[PDB]
Design an enzyme around this catalytic site. Structure first.
Site, PDB file in Angstrom:
ATOM      1  N   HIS A 138       0.933  -1.068  -0.252  1.00 33.96           N
ATOM      2  CA  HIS A 138       0.027   0.001  -0.013  1.00 33.96           C
ATOM      3  C   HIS A 138       1.005   1.184   0.181  1.00 33.96           C
ATOM      4  O   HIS A 138       1.976   0.986   0.781  1.00 33.96           O
ATOM      5  CB  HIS A 138      -1.031  -0.043   0.831  1.00 33.96           C
ATOM      6  CG  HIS A 138      -1.718   0.849   1.042  1.00 33.96           C
ATOM      7  ND1 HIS A 138      -3.133   1.031   0.465  1.00 33.96           N
ATOM      8  CD2 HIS A 138      -1.913   2.526   1.920  1.00 33.96           C
ATOM      9  CE1 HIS A 138      -3.405   2.238   0.601  1.00 33.96           C
ATOM     10  NE2 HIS A 138      -2.631   3.092   1.937  1.00 33.96           N
ATOM     11  N   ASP A 167      -2.628   9.842   2.700  1.00 39.41           N
ATOM     12  CA  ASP A 167      -2.829   8.208   2.354  1.00 39.41           C
ATOM     13  C   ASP A 167      -4.520   8.003   1.823  1.00 39.41           C
ATOM     14  O   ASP A 167      -5.375   8.985   2.250  1.00 39.41           O
ATOM     15  CB  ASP A 167      -3.176   7.216   3.559  1.00 39.41           C
ATOM     16  CG  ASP A 167      -3.308   5.403   3.616  1.00 39.41           C
ATOM     17  OD1 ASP A 167      -3.778   5.742   2.270  1.00 39.41           O
ATOM     18  OD2 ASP A 167      -2.595   5.445   4.610  1.00 39.41           O
ATOM     19  N   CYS A 207      -3.947   3.506  -4.512  1.00 41.54           N
ATOM     20  CA  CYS A 207      -3.807   3.679  -3.975  1.00 41.54           C
ATOM     21  C   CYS A 207      -2.011   4.344  -4.317  1.00 41.54           C
ATOM     22  O   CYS A 207      -1.671   5.624  -3.605  1.00 41.54           O
ATOM     23  CB  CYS A 207      -2.608   2.906  -2.061  1.00 41.54           C
ATOM     24  SG  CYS A 207      -1.349   1.795  -2.936  1.00 41.54           S
TER      25      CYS A 207
END
Length: 247
Positions: A109, A139, A192
């Site tokens: 991620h 994020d 992401c």
């Protein structure tokens, strides 16, 4: 067998990164962006999208920075890992910078850590304005290792400041707060990385100058910009492939 599509920046330039067809593969929907694509586009943004000012006031570490900062005598824990990346700032003082970007990939991620105004000692404000030394975490979701990341960076800064300034400054939770501004969230799995790139792009087009909590960036960019981003990047790479071929 692989084919190197581009070298960015292309020579005569010196810090050239190579991008192959396999690297393009990760631009497919449902594919995690690899290191090469992240570092490539970030270089592109610094060389083609950031204003001259923002370029002088910013520094972007490659994805290997944090990776190397975490992996393994008289040194302490803080100065043992800093020794692992002490070279990344040999010819550059980061305390002269307003923004220091650190791409982070944990458990596949991607999320971003942006060290802001490391030269400020505390929060300042006036016409309401507000800035402070701090660490922003951008994020598209939420990472589990975030606190570990923030603590490693504060400790990275302590050593680095001691190595350059020859003095002792304490980068602490209260000294240099960590903030998670509210930014657009991930819609598709495996995206992401795309969000990380969009964050830096949006940050360069419209930097964060006010740090008054909470930092509202819920509509930082339109959702369609994310939707076409993987493809836009692929087109960019192939467009440059033909340019570095035309010459």
């Amino acid at each position: 067998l692989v084919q190197k599509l581009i070298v960015y920046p292309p020579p005569p330039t010196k810090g050239g990164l190579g991008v192959t067809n396999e690297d393009l593969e990760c631009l497919e929907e449902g594919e995690f962006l690899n290191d090469v694509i992240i570092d490539f586009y970030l270089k592109y943004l610094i060389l083609e999208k950031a204003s001259d000012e923002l370029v002088e006031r910013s520094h972007i570490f490659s994805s290997f920075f944090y990776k190397c900062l975490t992996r393994k005598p008289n040194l302490s824990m803080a100065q043992r890992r800093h020794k692992r990346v002490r070279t990344w700032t040999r010819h550059i003082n980061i305390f002269n910078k307003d923004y220091i970007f650190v791409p982070v990939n944990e458990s596949s991620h991607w999320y971003l850590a942006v060290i802001c105004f490391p030269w400020l000692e505390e929060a300042v404000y006036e016409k309401k304005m507000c800035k402070r030394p701090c660490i922003l975490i951008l994020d598209s979701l939420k990472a589990a290792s975030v606190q570990n990341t923030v603590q490693n960076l504060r400790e990275y800064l302590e050593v680095e400041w001691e190595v350059k300034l020859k003095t002792h400054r304490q980068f602490s939770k209260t000294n240099m707060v960590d903030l998670c501004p509210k930014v657009p969230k991930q819609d598709n799995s495996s995206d992401c990385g795309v969000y990380l790139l969009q964050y830096v792009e949006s940050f360069f087009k419209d930097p964060i100058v006010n740090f008054e909590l909470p930092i509202h960036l819920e509509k930082w960019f339109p959702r369609h910009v994310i939707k076409t981003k993987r493809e836009d990047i692929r087109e960019l790479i192939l467009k440059l492939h033909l340019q570095q071929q035309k010459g």
